[PDB]
Design a protein around this ligand. Structure first.
Ligand code: ZN
Length: 323
């Protein structure tokens, strides 16, 4: 009876030295992400809408153009909603599908449904078009390093559909894509042929990005079983800062601060956390002031903060994967 699902408990990062940190800082481009990955997603994209299809095609196309061996799968399902039965499609992008373990980065790509108001349209820029673009930029920036994976451990990106409630939050009306996918992964043997382990046992850590893009975010350390990885984000932030690799940044105004958070936040990690998956939830507390308003738009995004977080995230991922 292999103990491989316990490996994640002892897994340590392979820390990057100063020269490598400068390389990562120089290898990501916030302006290229902005134009090529983010702007195409700043459209109305609630589930089942024409924009939802356009956002999915954009995400799939940007991944497909990369050199690394990404395997794309669309998880399409039906769910009851306040508006009746509807179809949803989660996007899963995986390197080394048969590898036993994967570090997983995730966000939701749907935008909350609102009828147009005074000619304004809700596009959910921080919620979560920026997180989606950050994941696409990370795949692009780290492409040459990721190509080398072609520790039986690799990387998977998940873009959930239907995270938002169609009305206001309720247990049945929200998290459509993550409740579906967590249940599906929980009942899928992994690796192929396994007798008693599932895809969820293979998820080392689920790093969920949500509501990112506003100024001065503060991310609390929510869970004790991922606290040591939260500490790594703090250390990476501190060292990139000391190396002069972050922009418009101070340690007093650091993003990853020492402090827990006892409450529960309804978000896509919930169905995974309730099935025993370790989660590192990168959602700020408090939420962006523009949360769920028409002002959650491009103009209110903080470019340097997103750039700094791209650098921190990319370093975290390379160190976790020993790349
Ligand atoms: Zn939202």
């Amino acid at each position: 009876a292999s103990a491989w699902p316990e490996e994640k408990n002892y897994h340590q990062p392979a820390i990057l030295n100063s020269s490598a940190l400068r390389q990562i800082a120089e290898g990501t481009s916030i302006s290229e992400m902005w134009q090529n990955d983010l702007q195409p997603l700043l459209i109305e994209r609630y589930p089942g809408s024409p924009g939802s299809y356009a956002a999915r095609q954009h995400i799939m196309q940007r991944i497909q153009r990369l050199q690394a061996d990404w395997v794309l799968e669309i998880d399409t399902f039906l769910s009851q909603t306040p508006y009746g039965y509807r179809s949803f499609s989660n996007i899963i992008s995986t390197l080394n599908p048969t590898a036993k373990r994967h570090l997983v980065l995730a966000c939701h790509y749907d935008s909350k449904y609102f009828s147009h108001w005074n000619n304004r349209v809700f596009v959910g820029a921080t919620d979560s078009a920026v997180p989606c673009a950050m994941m696409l930029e990370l795949a692009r920036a780290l492409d040459k390093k990721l190509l080398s994976l072609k520790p039986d451990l690799s990387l998977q990106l998940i873009f959930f559909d239907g995270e938002e409630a169609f009305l206001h939050w309720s247990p049945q009306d929200s998290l459509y894509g993550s409740r579906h996918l967590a249940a599906k992964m929980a009942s899928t043997p992994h690796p192929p042929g396994a007798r008693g382990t599932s895809q969820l046992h293979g998820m080392d850590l689920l790093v969920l990005l949500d509501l990112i893009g506003a100024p001065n975010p503060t991310f609390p350390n929510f869970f004790p079983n991922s606290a040591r990885w939260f500490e790594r984000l703090q250390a990476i932030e501190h060292e990139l800062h000391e190396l002069g690799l972050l922009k418009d940044h101070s340690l007093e105004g650091r993003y990853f601060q020492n402090y827990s958070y006892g409450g529960v936040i309804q978000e896509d990690h919930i169905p995974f956390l309730r099935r025993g998956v370790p989660v590192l939830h990168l959602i700020p507390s408090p939420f962006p002031e523009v949360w769920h308003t028409m002002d959650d738009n491009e103009e209110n995004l903080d470019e340097s903060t997103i750039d700094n977080l791209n650098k921190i995230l990319q370093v975290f991922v390379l160190e976790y994967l020993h790349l």
